[PDB]
Amino acid sequence: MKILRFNEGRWGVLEGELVLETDGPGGNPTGRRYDLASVTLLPPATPTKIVCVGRNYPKEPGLFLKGPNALARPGNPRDPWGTAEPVPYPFFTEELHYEGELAVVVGDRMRHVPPEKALDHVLGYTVAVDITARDVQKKDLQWVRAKSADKFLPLGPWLETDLNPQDTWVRTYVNGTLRQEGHTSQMIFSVAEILSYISTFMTLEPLDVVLTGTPEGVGALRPGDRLEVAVEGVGTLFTLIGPKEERPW
Amino acid sequence: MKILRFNEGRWGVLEGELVLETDGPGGNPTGRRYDLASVTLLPPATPTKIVCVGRNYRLPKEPGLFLKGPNALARPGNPRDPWGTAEPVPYPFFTEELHYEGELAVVVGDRMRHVPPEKALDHVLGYTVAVDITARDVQKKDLQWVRAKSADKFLPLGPWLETDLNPQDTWVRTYVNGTLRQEGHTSQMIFSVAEILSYISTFMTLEPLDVVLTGTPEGVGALRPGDRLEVAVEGVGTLFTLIGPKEERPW
């Protein structure tokens, strides 16, 4: 089942081309319905925090954080490039990378949850583009500016509630050209193991977002570049890079 | 004035020993009042994120930064009964090098994006106190300081925020089990509060009620289960917190 957030933070379930509004994620229908093209798609979550895995394609998962300010609206499939929220090419970097990833939206609070019970706390899966500024990532104290600058996390188009996270494909296309491709069965740490690990020291709240890592093929980006990340059984995330920004003031 | 959050996420202003409830932070009074001793003090903010500064007391060219998730927030001890109300910070199973760092904390009032240093402070709602709990061992080995700085309860915050203050003219003092361990004058900050907020805003938009930590003075030492911590910031207040028993295997 596809669950989405749209317009002024509304929730709904996608029924073909019809968006059936619900009271809360996957909740009872309110009675309103909208044509998919007529709504403004939003990241399918309202996270208190975003936890991301490093190399996943290490005795334990490497983790880093992104603030919610990194979230960027996904392009509406009915009009991709005309609606996707642009990721400004930062003035502080010159090594901007992209990383297509499978993303997890937590459904139930998780604290000290064993691997075998981890997926039961998942609301659904969605797609993300972990934007990275590699040049500052090497010289900064921590990856704050490198991974958590504004819009460094396009997320969407919606989440799928029924899926086998360890058996799906992630394909990233840059300007129509396939640049990344990977099978989640090749994950060093499974989604379940990742969520479980995190829960040992950090409680995951309902609707928090967890990035599962990026496959091989990470390349550079240029202003104007158009990205398309398709994840079998989930959906396709459309996002693009905006023009180079100048000095802040 | 002193603004606080209490009970079921209610906001209020402090007058002596009375908490006067308001509609939002510093908002209109509702007409309800409570005795301080009768309410459950909460961290004075509901941050979308917590941005922290690294070394900042007397050298880096730019402020070093790191994040903490809201899960790190821990209730401040109520000044009317400190040790009996403060939310304990469990001594984690994953570390054996837990350290304390008392710090001045800032609570953002108005959204900040590309704000120059000279306009920074005008966007501040107020100032409060914090203890940046740190697990030093994992901090050296892990990929990033996630469990080193963002483990549950790694951020006691409170007791409340002060709206009227000169951030660069106050003292931060940390006491452990009745003994002074840290003492720093904020005028000795490498980066001023205004510069820190400004810097952050050049790439990261700060939302209303986000929290920003401004670094810690010398005196960072090791903690032990049962330690009673007090961080006093002149003109702001005193944050009371404590370390709980060491935890064992997660499951």
TrEMBL record, chain A:
<keyword id="KW-0479">Metal-binding</keyword>
<dbReference type="GO" id="GO:0016853">
    <property type="term" value="F:isomerase activity"/>
</dbReference>
<dbReference type="Pfam" id="PF01557">
    <property type="entry name" value="FAA_hydrolase"/>
</dbReference>
<feature type="domain" description="Fumarylacetoacetase-like C-terminal">
    <location>
        <begin position="49"/>
        <end position="237"/>
    </location>
</feature>
<dbReference type="InterPro" id="IPR036663">
    <property type="entry name" value="Fumarylacetoacetase_C_sf"/>
</dbReference>
<dbReference type="GO" id="GO:0018773">
    <property type="term" value="F:acetylpyruvate hydrolase activity"/>
</dbReference>
<keyword id="KW-0413">Isomerase</keyword>
<protein>
    <submittedName>
        <fullName>Probable 2-hydroxyhepta-2,4-diene-1,7-dioate isomerase</fullName>
    </submittedName>
</protein>
<dbReference type="InterPro" id="IPR018833">
    <property type="entry name" value="Rv2993c-like_N"/>
</dbReference>
<dbReference type="GO" id="GO:0046872">
    <property type="term" value="F:metal ion binding"/>
</dbReference>
<dbReference type="GO" id="GO:0019752">
    <property type="term" value="P:carboxylic acid metabolic process"/>
</dbReference>
<dbReference type="Pfam" id="PF10370">
    <property type="entry name" value="Rv2993c-like_N"/>
</dbReference>
<dbReference type="InterPro" id="IPR011234">
    <property type="entry name" value="Fumarylacetoacetase-like_C"/>
</dbReference>
<feature type="domain" description="Rv2993c-like N-terminal">
    <location>
        <begin position="1"/>
        <end position="44"/>
    </location>
</feature>
TrEMBL record, chain B:
<feature type="domain" description="Rv2993c-like N-terminal">
    <location>
        <begin position="1"/>
        <end position="44"/>
    </location>
</feature>
<dbReference type="GO" id="GO:0018773">
    <property type="term" value="F:acetylpyruvate hydrolase activity"/>
</dbReference>
<dbReference type="InterPro" id="IPR018833">
    <property type="entry name" value="Rv2993c-like_N"/>
</dbReference>
<dbReference type="InterPro" id="IPR011234">
    <property type="entry name" value="Fumarylacetoacetase-like_C"/>
</dbReference>
<protein>
    <submittedName>
        <fullName>Probable 2-hydroxyhepta-2,4-diene-1,7-dioate isomerase</fullName>
    </submittedName>
</protein>
<keyword id="KW-0413">Isomerase</keyword>
<feature type="domain" description="Fumarylacetoacetase-like C-terminal">
    <location>
        <begin position="49"/>
        <end position="239"/>
    </location>
</feature>
<dbReference type="GO" id="GO:0016853">
    <property type="term" value="F:isomerase activity"/>
</dbReference>
<dbReference type="GO" id="GO:0019752">
    <property type="term" value="P:carboxylic acid metabolic process"/>
</dbReference>
<dbReference type="GO" id="GO:0046872">
    <property type="term" value="F:metal ion binding"/>
</dbReference>
<keyword id="KW-0479">Metal-binding</keyword>
<dbReference type="Pfam" id="PF10370">
    <property type="entry name" value="Rv2993c-like_N"/>
</dbReference>
<dbReference type="Pfam" id="PF01557">
    <property type="entry name" value="FAA_hydrolase"/>
</dbReference>
<dbReference type="InterPro" id="IPR036663">
    <property type="entry name" value="Fumarylacetoacetase_C_sf"/>
</dbReference>
